[PDB]
């Protein structure tokens with residue numbers, strides 16, 4: 001017997017999500033971030049809302065801008081979104097794409113000159129994800145060919161064929177780095193859940209527009225790696241860092257990554273159409289969602305940030321785990337039929353509106369303290385694009401559309 005929120009409630013939530021996406025998030029990005037000096041988009045916007053057109057620009061950020069406007073154009077049709085995606089795409093191919101060695105640089109100066117030429121797999125993945133989405137939105141052939149080329153370079157220079165998975169960073173000419181850390185925050189270990197989750201994400205979107213046989217095998221191997229080595233059935237959490245043989249080298253827990261993975265793993269297995277693997281993926285997915293429900297939430301329904309290596313709970317609410325919880329909890333409801341997950345989705349949405357959203361300055365606060373106080377962090381930077389929250393809104397709109405259809409037409 002189906003337990004489903006009534007039509008008024010589903011439609012009201014869907015409407016609020018659409019309003020937030022179009023009138024806050026995408027409006028902010030389309031108006032505040034374009035740079036008419038160097039083209040493209042600024043690399044940073046400060047806490048006061050001031051853009052910085054001369055700040056260094058990251059590949060991940062720019063791929064995220066491309067992905068978000070491409071996906072929004074595809075789903076909503078608004079011409080402004082195609083215009084913004086095109087703007088992101090042209091700068092991306094001009095400056096981030098290495099025309100000689102292939103793949104994308106980590107960071108360029110505002111004028112486009114390469115600043116940090118490392119080829120990090122996390123950044124290569126976002127390039128694939130964004131380029132494939134731009135192809136899905138516009139049918140561009142160069143974009144798809146480029147996404148394919150980057151896939152090839154990852155497999156050639158990074159795949160670990162003894163152990164499964166990938167070396168996570170190389171230099172410009174694809175010679176492996178000893179230091180594959182994304183940032184000073186990350187453990188200096190050779191394998192991370194974080195990078196591998198985004199490889200999976202990218203490969204799934206690529207497979208959508210280019211269903212190559214070998215890609216299906218690599219995508220399947222990635223799903224299997226998650227089930228065997230990364231997801232921990234005793235705890236319902238993803239292990240964060242490993243050695244090359246996937247021996248755990250971390251005890252931290254990241255609620256945001258758990259709940260993001262909960263829906264991304266199912267998206268990937270469904271893009272493949274891998275019916276044999278689905279039940280086990282579904283089981284892991286629901287477990288991740290339940291563990292997040294039980295351990296990662298404040299009494300207001302928002303998500304805490306992490307439990308660190310020494311056990312400390314970081315109670316800060318970062319913007320992106322809230323976004324991922326919206327999608328992951330709605331997904332858990334769709335999978336299980338258990339309305340407690342819808343209730344959790346509603347609770348995090350109310351938190352997003354009442355605390356995470358920056359009503360004064362536009363967009364969403366990067367971080368809000370446990371007492372409700374916003375931190376004066378940058379509004380846009382290397383690590384904060386429009387992708388987590390933009391995607392979360394697009395996903396919720398579509399998932400709610402499907403739930404609304406459970407009232408059969410007569």
Ligand SMILES: OC[C@H]1O[C@@H](O[C@H]2[C@H](O)[C@H](O)[C@H](O)O[C@@H]2CO)[C@H](O)[C@@H](O)[C@@H]1O
Pocket residue numbers: 182183184185186194320383384
């Ligand atoms: O640890 C590296 C940086 O991660 C950033 O958080 C990421 C997160 O790791 C995950 O990949 C998610 O999908 O995107 C998040 C936002 O960019 C974090 O904000 C940075 O502080 C870290 O340096």
Ligand SMILES: [Cl-]
Pocket residue numbers: 064383384385386387388389
């Ligand atoms: Cl983002």
